[PDB]
């Protein structure tokens, strides 16, 4: 798992530019329904108990997920050596994640072995959630209003199965973008499964 993998059959779906601050895109149908289900089924027997339950897949652990990992590498244009594995979270019944940052809220804390600061987060929605559950970004320039109360606190994205949210947590010059602060709104009914892909500015392992 270095570089970008084979060029077949690169993803060519709709890309919606959501926001300048932070820099965020929604990728429509980034994953197939099959892929979403595959991940949930593989994750489930491994889950342990923000309050929700989570598990990890090592980068490249699994050939189905590896294909997605290569997809991510190619759409972001950032080589796989800069990527962590796949973290899968499951939420239900009020469960959530208070708005937070992905970067060290002091940048001297991310060293060469971690690959420096996290630059891109790609949030992959593995289920469509039913009520609430929006990803919220409170510090965003523009807020939604047309949507749980929680969501009206920033820019929000609805978790629709197969969509992915992609956003930058560093500014172009490499400084922290406090606009990338983000949380998961209470999920109100019934199941939020998401997978997170974090990508670093430099390669991990050094
Ligand atoms: Cl989220």
1-206: CATH superfamily: q2cbj1_9rhob like domain (2.60.120.620)
State whether residue 173 is helix, strand or coil: coil
Can you tell me the distance from the alpha carbon of 44 to that of 4, in angstroms, rounded to the nearest whole number? 28
Q: 9, exposed or middle or buried, with CB in 10 Å at 0-12, 13-18, 19+?
A: exposed
The approach used to solve this structure was X-ray
CA of 115 to the centre of ligand 1 (A): 23
Other C-beta atoms within 10 Å of 86: how many? 27
Other C-beta atoms within 10 Å of 45: how many? 7
CA of 173 to the centre of ligand 1 (A): 25
CA of 109 to the centre of ligand 1 (A): 24
CA of 100 to the centre of ligand 1 (A): 10
**Token pair for 196:** 């997170």
β-pair partners for 19:
24
Taking CA atoms, 169 is separated from 50, 106, 163, in Å, by 20, 13, 19
Contact indicator for 28, 13 with CB cutoff of 8 Å: yes
State whether residue 85 is helix, strand or coil: coil
Q: Phi first, then psi: what are they for 189, rounded to 5°?
A: -155, 145
Contact indicator for 24, 18 with CB cutoff of 8 Å: yes
How far the first Cα of the chain sits from its last, in Å, is: 15
Domain locations along the chain: 1-206
Contact indicator for 163, 29 with CB cutoff of 8 Å: yes
CA of 128 to the centre of ligand 1 (A): 13
Can you tell me the distance from the alpha carbon of 103 to that of 62, in angstroms, rounded to the nearest whole number? 27
H helices present in 58-100, as ranges = 63-76
CA of 134 to the centre of ligand 1 (A): 7
CA of 47 to the centre of ligand 1 (A): 17
CA of 145 to the centre of ligand 1 (A): 18
| Nearest alpha-carbon partner for 198 in 86, 76, 57, 52 | 86
- Please report which helix (H) or strand (E) contains residue 35, including its range: helix 33-43
In this structure, the strands spanning 53-57 and 86-91 are antiparallel
């Amino acid at each position: 798992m270095v570089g970008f993998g084979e060029l077949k059959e690169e993803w060519r779906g709709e890309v919606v530019h959501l926001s300048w601050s932070p820099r965020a895109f929604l990728l429509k149908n980034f994953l197939s329904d099959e892929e979403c289900d595959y991940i949930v089924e593989k994750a489930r027997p491994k889950m342990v108990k923000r309050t929700s339950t989570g598990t990890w897949f090592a980068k490249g652990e699994d050939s189905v997920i590896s294909k997605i990992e290569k997809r991510v590498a190619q759409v972001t244009m950032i080589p796989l050596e800069n990527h962590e594995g796949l973290q899968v979270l499951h939420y239900h019944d009020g469960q959530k994640y208070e708005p937070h940052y992905d970067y060290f809220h002091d940048p001297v804390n991310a060293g060469p072995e971690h690959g420096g600061q996290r630059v891109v987060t790609m949030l992959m929605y593995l289920t469509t959630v039913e009520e609430g559950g929006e990803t919220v970004l409170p510090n965003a320039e523009q807020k939604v209003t047309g949507w749980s109360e929680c969501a009206k606190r920033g820019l929000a994205v609805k978790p629709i199965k197969g969509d992915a949210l992609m956003f930058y947590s560093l500014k172009p010059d490499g400084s922290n973008d406090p606009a990338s602060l983000h949380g998961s709104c209470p999920t109100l009914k019934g199941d939020k499964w998401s997978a997170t892909k974090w990508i670093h500015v430099a390669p991990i392992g050094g």
